[PDB]
Amino acid sequence: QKTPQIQVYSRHPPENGKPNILNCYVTQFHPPHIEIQMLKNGKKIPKVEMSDMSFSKDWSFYILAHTEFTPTETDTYACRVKHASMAEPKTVYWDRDM
Amino acid sequence: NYTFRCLQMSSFANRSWSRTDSVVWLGDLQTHRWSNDSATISFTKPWSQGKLSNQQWEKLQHMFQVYRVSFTRDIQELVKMMSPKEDYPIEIQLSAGCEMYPGNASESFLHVAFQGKYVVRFWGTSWQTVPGAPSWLDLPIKVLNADQGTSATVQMLLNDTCPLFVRGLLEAGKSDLEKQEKPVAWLSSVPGHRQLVCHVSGFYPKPVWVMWMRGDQEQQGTHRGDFLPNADETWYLQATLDVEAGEEAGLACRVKHSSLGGQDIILYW
Ligand SMILES: CCCCCCCC/C=C\CCCCCCCCCCCCCC(=O)N[C@@H](CO[C@@H]1O[C@H](CO)[C@H](O)[C@H](OS(=O)(=O)O)[C@H]1O)[C@H](O)/C=C/CCCCCCCCCCCCC
Ligand SMILES: *[C@@H]1O[C@H](CO)[C@@H](O)[C@H](O)[C@H]1NC(C)=O
Ligand SMILES: *[C@@H]1O[C@H](CO)[C@@H](O)[C@H](O)[C@H]1NC(C)=O
Ligand SMILES: *[C@@H]1O[C@H](CO)[C@@H](O)[C@H](O)[C@H]1NC(C)=O
């Protein structure tokens, strides 16, 4: 069993008030069964799209989720991943920079 | 000079639940997907049929449709006959395709992982377990090797079908494979030291050069992160430099990429 790693980052320079796309790239997990949510102020974002799961040269799985978002000075964004390797969902907050 | 990868992912939870999902890549561009709940393979590019007729493509798809069913049945039977006597769950990954080398012969491969570990390959004309695989796996491989029909079909697919199909793909996907997309860069920092970060996104193809600079002097302590995918199949990379308070003044992030035409991005902190 292998723990997912999570990176959260923007498609375009994050400018407050400007529509953009936020990515959550989840890698290195096994087995492939996984649940991924992206959160705005702790609430699931219903417009998240999921790329097809694939795997790397070294057999480890990966998948990319993404969503339209408008970063502002009052909203937080997060990606939350559930996987059998972890007792709790793992939540990683967007650092507001990436 | 591209590797074409057919990546199959099969999960067997019990005797009454399995799924098989595949994705296909030419280089770092996705050309096909085939999800368990579709009867047919989907094209994820306008050029995914390559240079095949509707008829040739149907026959190739038909072969995979028969395969998906047979593979599912065969794995479950093999497990039922094996050690430690029907051992669900089972995870299998299969990586098959060919590496094109313009001017010469393509090289083909078919590798198989079981419970996340590489165990088996097709080699020449038969299956083989690889050094360090669980020894019991020799038995289902011997069984699989009694199937002459399957061995002839796999040799055809790897030796002939794969490079012929890919050559067509390369020609038909030429404009995407050679597309240039431009990086856009931005700076941030986290804090007496701080880490400056240069974020670079939207470039294609993958090769890039990103350095923190002071005038023309490269800051060789620059650390580049992993390449991370954007949804539109361009790339993202960050490059960080650790600096002391006061050192930031006069540093810049510089990016070179094929798409820029020699006009580097230089962003001064
Ligand atoms: C590959 C490059 C080609 C380019 C095409 C590009 C388009 C790709 C688009 C989507 C691709 C989907 C991803 C799939 C990845 C490729 C997989 C390669 C394996 C293909 C094998 C094809 C052959 C096949 O279907 N065999 C199947 C049908 O066999 C046939 O069965 C018939 C009766 O049912 C007859 O016995 C027949 O004999 S005959 O005398 O009448 O001809 C015989 O050929 C066969 O059952 C399947 C065998 C499975 C091979 C896979 C083995 C996996 C590795 C084993 C590890 C097991 C470890 C766990 C054991 C407990
Ligand atoms: C097989 O496994 C799946 C878990 O993925 C589960 O839905 C079910 O309990 C099993 N199927 C049955 C009903 O035997
Ligand atoms: C996957 O597709 C196969 C073939 O149609 C089907 O029998 C099986 O039930 C599917 N698995 C799931 C989990 O839907
Ligand atoms: C496919 O290539 C292997 C060598 O890589 C060879 O041993 C085998 O005979 C070939 N089969 C066909 C049908 O060309």
What are the residue boundaries of the structural domains of chain A, listed by start? Answer: 1-98
Residue B226 annotated as binding? Answer: no
Length of chain B in terms of residues written:
269
Both structure tokens of B33: 């997907």
**Whether residue B17 has its Cβ less than 6 Å from ligand 2:** yes
Asked if the Cβ–Cβ distance from B231 to A33 is below 8 Å, we say no
**What residues contact residue A75 under an 8 Å CB cut-off, 6+ apart?**
A40, A41
Both structure tokens of A4: 């997912």
Determine the residue of B122, B125, B154, B158 to mutate for testing ligand 4's pocket, defined as the one with the most ligand atoms within 8 A of the Cβ atom. Answer: B125
Q: Name where chain B breaks: residue before each gap, C-N > 2.5 Å.
A: 191
How far, in Å, CA of B117 to CA of A59, rounded?
Answer: 8
Q: Cis peptide before A46, with omega less than 30 degrees from 0?
A: no
Looking at domain A1-98, its CATH class is mainly beta
How far, in Å, CA of B69 to CA of B73, rounded?
Answer: 6
* Chain A: residues touching B (Cβ < 8 Å): 2, 7, 9-14, 21, 23, 25, 30-33, 49, 51-55, 59, 61, 64, 66, 95, 97-98
- CB distance from B113 to chain A under 8 Å? yes
**DSSP annotation of B160:** I
Ligand nearest to the CA of B121: 1
Domains of chain B and any CATH numbers? 1-178 (3.30.500.10), 179-269 (2.60.40.10)
How far, in Å, CA of B68 to CA of B83, rounded?
Answer: 23
CA atoms within 13 A on the CB side of A72: 6
Q: How much of chain A is in helix, strand and coil states, percent to nearest 5? A: 0, 50, 50
Alpha carbon distances (Å) from B200 to B98, B259, B266: 32, 13, 12
**Whether residue B19 has its Cβ less than 6 Å from ligand 3:** yes
**Whether residue B14 has its Cβ less than 6 Å from ligand 2:** yes
Pairing mode, if any, of strands A54-55 and B17-26? unpaired
- CB distance from B230 to chain A under 8 Å? yes
CA of residue A18 relative to chain centroid, distance: 20
**DSSP annotation of B157:** I
